[PDB]
């Protein structure tokens, strides 16, 4: 018959979310409650009713007593799991109380940058039983699982936390227990507003101010240099994310500014070609279209992405 | 009844404060004094009154003697704690004298960048008893706790150090002991004065010198390029800090220079529009306002932030 | 006679492919099935038919019983192999069932950047028997080997996976068993299209728009600055790859743009030399060749590489 | 009575000096000679007079024999000390001969950048006895201590090495032994001459050549851009050092170039203001002062720092 | 009498050569054959003639039998040596067969950048006996030592490999054995040709094309900006190497381009001073010298370094 293994997982800290490598790092405490009647013991008066063991000697005790422990794996773990505490408290009953304090990076494969920077992501930790459900069954340890209140993450803001149990078939033919700690987090846009939106909007607006100078050559030089600035911002954005196989809302936004700037060069080349061909009065009358086109093109572009993505 | 566990924590070095990840790194010595009568021993003349043990065999001795040690955790620890020394000296009495020399990173969740770079921060180390206050009670080991005098930190300057004891309820129903080593540190502004204030002030002042040339086109080209420089400084600042969800005094300072520079372009576009419309004498009379506006705008801006943040 | 050792290797995650260092990193599970009759045991009613061991005590048991285990090496491994699980399940029969969960970097020496970014690469993991084929023979553990479905790699896309067995002669005179897990992966071009093709094409096209201004000096200044931009892109590409001893399709592409831009400067220097020597009407008639040359040169260049590499 | 512990420390390599973090890294061999009569032994003919032990079993032997070993700490150590060798050779006499080969980072708190890059620094390694001078006294192991001849450091050049003994009161009431290995090193200026002095001097000299063109507008544009170059060099320098609370000779040097460049803009604005107000012949006569001012200002500045710092 | 210790070292991979830190990283296999008659054993029919041990228990066996093992050190090792395999096979004879598979960084103190990038470097691994030549003598294990055929290094190309034995006096009075694995490697120049030579040559050639425009002011602006580009390339080169105390062929090359560019500004300032002083026909006749000087100066410079370094 299968023995109930009570899994509890609590994230104390989010040491960082690395979106370029699609992983996240946490400081967490794993808690297990497992009653093994075979491990029960007798005690003399004065002698303790609860025995405390370092994982090392407790496992040496299980091998001796020929007992199978609920061997588990953190399925989505990455690299080294640096441990702080691995402590066992065994009661007279045979109730094993295990605490595992660690720092570890976990894979974040649920990363969807399609709406970046206005994106909401799913982050999870998978705890899998190596032995199937006929031997061990994971149960939800009540009053422990979740996320702490001093996570130390500044960019991300956790919207909700969930815990559930499911099956997996990793090393076995039949179903094996899997404990899931899931959390959703959205982004603080302040960085993107201050470093990307405000600068890009300023470059466009203050470049439009110079249209009132009525110098087409000057506009051509300005739009040319503006295109270079946007190419630079394009590289600034690309450095934050992985080399995705799909277009970001941010990628569409930058390509958009490229197109408009390209056309601004094209248009003012045409107006300056009119001036050069003795048609200055004509280019000056058409100039109203060039001056009002610019804000409308960018405001039409903004409504195009907003429609194409929402 | 509960046994008194004497906690002492001394920071020898500050290997660095990483404000982008909101953590700090120290080289520290943990000292514990704990009297366990069960560990007491008898000795023959000439035989030692004090037994010295490597933590490994001392824990093997506690498991044998069925004794529970005051299992503790550095609550705000991050990653690997690299150890130097883990040594035990056990007296005939049963007084355990423990020394733990380590290098480790600790979470700094108290980070408030709102007044950066004129900010004062709180840094702490939390030492928690896994077992509740009915079993073990932490006490302040006198004549040890604090910070050394060769911390090796150059940017930060520690203003004060504090030690106190409090309860926590991390793994238990009832209160459990927590030792706290806290320190406040303010920043050395020399870097920000030399690399950010002096350059930004120079760019603004020497750009104002060229107003005396009375070439509005030249001013437009200058203010346009100045805006780009400030956008570059904006990225230089952003690289030091996390992607915060709030505005910094520094962020307000840069946005301030953007606004003024934007208006400088706007104003000189207007003056040059007057010259282009045969109103050169008028633009030259108004030029006194443009020349005196510039220093007043920046000096009004400086007083605006200083009021808005202080 | 030789004992059959059943090797199974499954990659759960691709934590990253580092093309600058020509290596890749995985989270993987190694599975071994090995029947050693000497390890067989007798059991009492109620006592388990399957004994579970930590690798540490299981090896201590093999040394005691004077049994030689199939000592193996991951031939192309690099750095530290961080382990998660090292668990043994021994049946009454003497069938050893081993599971090795790890995170590790592996050498990728098959890297051929000649057609980068349109390249397809081979990645493999080599599992070698230290002892020759007369002692141990590796066999393919059926229903396990391969790659998972949540690898978490965004740039690369795995085209096919293969498993085979071969000999090696690393530490022995005679042939020794080698298990191979191979996979082919091609690249997602979206990054290169968005950050390199679109910008380079835009710079060239919008620079051509200004030819319609009929200012040869302006073209010279433009082509000169364009050359600098391409030199900058050249450095952006070089940072992704190792310092190869061969030319990339990308390197040829950039050298191509250098040559055309160099000749654009040369041509427009000539046209401006005609204007300076009182031959303005002649330079204006020849200008049709200069304006139509530019798109033809770049379109001839594109067809040259495409032929030279395909 | 106290037992003499013979300390010897030899640095084989300087893997690097990190001046931004004020630490240094070495590959070193620690050698200890300690006579403990209690550890002495008897031997049969043929049996060895010298017993060789792995630190692990030798410490297990000391715990058994209830002997206190001279527990020591590398006081200024940082992070992980990666060990190569930890070997004990025990003679029939009871003379313990210990060798500790390691790679480790050590705090460099003696860093004084005030005269950077012409600075001389002190680097040391502190070896402290955990037990006081009444139990163990450190003595200088002769014919071992110092620095090797293939340190592999290219920027720094070790001027002298010293070894001495002093007391410390880290964990004890009374004085405890401390072994000190100190070395002084000065910097190779070639990098600073080639990358900072020569470029800055060239920018200034070749900018002065253009004064002979007699175009005040051109000088204003040149000095403005030069100021930007110096701001860039300012950031190049700041990246090598920590965010110090004091001024560097280098910081003074850069601030100096800012001031002169600021005044160059101011002066040429004045000369161009004379030309604009029909005073061209006057500005041309004063131009001798502007042309001779520039070299004198920079040569007066160079003598100002040289006096202010030497 | 001394016992022969057979050393064999084979490098499977070159994980990278870090020329900034003057070290290199390898994946290697160390092989030792050592006959210790004291370790010999008796066997019954059916019982094995060869005993297989994990280094841990084999060393525990040597301490028990009071046998001294040939304790060795990798003299030029750096940091952590991550081990894969540490396996012992002991024959009835007492022949110890040891295999050590590792990943490790090693000091490269032989680095001579004087002719960089046309340099050839020496890389080695030193294996030293802690015990002198009277106890243990290292011998060359034949048919093993060298370098593999899938080293995975792309920039460097190994020219030759050598193995030899020498003495050292590190911890001993008398000579102690040292095994040396040496290899010479030269560089693949393709990176330097594509990223440094071609761009620098293009900048110079296309800047010369503009001399045919006969605008001295334009040349001054061009040479000034070219100087800035070379200063940028100067920083690009400096980032690859340590802060050496000697001049590189590359450093001389960049300083060379600075000098010529400085003189180009000087010359064209003179020609433009002639034009400004009503001597346009004279400056135009001298212009032949200015136009032919430029290619000759650079071609004289190239022959100067080539003579000064070869
Ligand atoms: C930069 C946006 C500011 C708009 C206001 C116009 C003033 C001129 C700004 O400077 C110019 O900006 C161009 C585009 O970035 C560069 O090509 C050029 O070299 C530089 O002189
Ligand atoms: C810029 C701070 C120094 C002000 C002193 C005035 C002299 C000219 C300095 O060069 C200026 O640099 C800007 C940024 O690149 C360009 O936009 C601008 O067109 C260019 O003239
Ligand atoms: C950048 C190509 C955009 C084409 C549109 C034509 C307008 C001018 C763009 O500014 C150009 O930027 C270069 C940057 O290197 C400078 O060298 C060059 O003198 C300058 O004119
Ligand atoms: C620049 C150091 C070399 C001086 C030699 C004189 C020739 C002109 C050099 O080009 C200058 O490049 C700066 C880039 O920042 C611009 O700001 C400035 O307007 C421009 O004139
Ligand atoms: C860059 C070498 C190309 C040679 C062909 C001349 C075309 C103009 C290229 O733009 C130039 O860029 C330099 C660097 O910023 C400036 O100093 C210079 O005044 C500017 O005109
Ligand atoms: Cs963080
Ligand atoms: Cs585990
Ligand atoms: Cs602990
Ligand atoms: Cs210009
Ligand atoms: Cs292994
Ligand atoms: Cs990835
Ligand atoms: Cs520091
Ligand atoms: Cs020590
Ligand atoms: Cs070095
Ligand atoms: Cs060793
Ligand atoms: Cs490599």
From TrEMBL, chains A, B, C, D, E:
Keywords: Membrane, Metal-binding, Transmembrane, Transmembrane helix, Zinc. One of its GO terms (cellular component) is membrane. GO terms for molecular function: extracellular ligand-gated monoatomic ion channel activity; metal ion binding; transmembrane signaling receptor activity. It is a multi-pass membrane protein. The keyword Nucleotide-binding does not apply. Its main location: membrane. It comes from the Bacteria. The keyword S-adenosyl-L-methionine does not apply. It is found in: Membrane. The chain crosses the membrane at residues 192-213, 220-238, 244-267, 288-310. Residues 1-129 form the Neurotransmitter-gated ion-channel ligand-binding domain. Zn(2+) binds at residues 43, 92. This is Cys-loop ligand-gated ion channel. It comes from endosymbiont of Tevnia jerichonana. The lineage of its organism: Bacteria, Pseudomonadati, Pseudomonadota, Gammaproteobacteria, sulfur-oxidizing symbionts.
């Amino acid at each position: 018959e299968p023995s109930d293994v009570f899994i509890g997982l609590k994230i104390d800290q989010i040491t960082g979310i690395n979106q370029k490598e699609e992983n996240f790092s946490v400081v967490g405490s794993l808690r297990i409650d497992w009653r093994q009647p075979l491990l029960a013991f007798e005690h003399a008066p004065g002698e303790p009713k609860h025995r405390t063991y370092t994982l090392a000697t407790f496992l040496k005790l299980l091998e001796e007593k020929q007992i199978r422990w609920p061997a588990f794996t953190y399925h989505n773990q990455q690299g080294r799991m640096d441990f702080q505490n691995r402590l066992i408290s065994l009661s007279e009953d045979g109730t094993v109380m295990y605490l595992e304090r660690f720092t570890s990076t976990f894979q974040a494969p649920a990363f969807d940058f399609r709406l970046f920077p206005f994106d909401n992501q799913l982050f999870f930790i998978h705890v899998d039983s190596i032995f199937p459900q006929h031997l061990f069954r994971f149960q939800e340890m009540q009053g422990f699982s979740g996320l702490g209140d001093q996570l130390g993450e500044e960019e991300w803001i956790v919207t909700e936390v969930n815990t559930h149990l499911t099956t997996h078939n990793e090393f076995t033919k039949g179903d094996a227990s899997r404990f899931v700690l899931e959390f959703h987090a959205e982004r603080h846009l302040n960085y993107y507003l201050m470093r990307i939106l405000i600068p890009v909007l300023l470059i466009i607006t203050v470049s439009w101010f110079t249209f009132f100078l009525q110098d087409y050559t000057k506009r051509i030089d300005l739009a040319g240099g503006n295109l270079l600035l946007f190419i630079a911002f394009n590289f600034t954005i690309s450095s934050d994310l992985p080399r995705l196989g799909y277009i970001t809302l941010m990628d569409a936004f930058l390509v958009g500014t490229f197109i408009i700037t390209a056309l601004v060069v094209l248009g003012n080349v045409w107006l300056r070609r009119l001036e050069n061909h003795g048609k200055q009065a004509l280019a000056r009358k058409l100039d109203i279209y060039a001056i009002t086109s610019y804000p409308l093109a960018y405001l039409l572009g903004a409504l195009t992405l907003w429609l194409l993505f929402f």
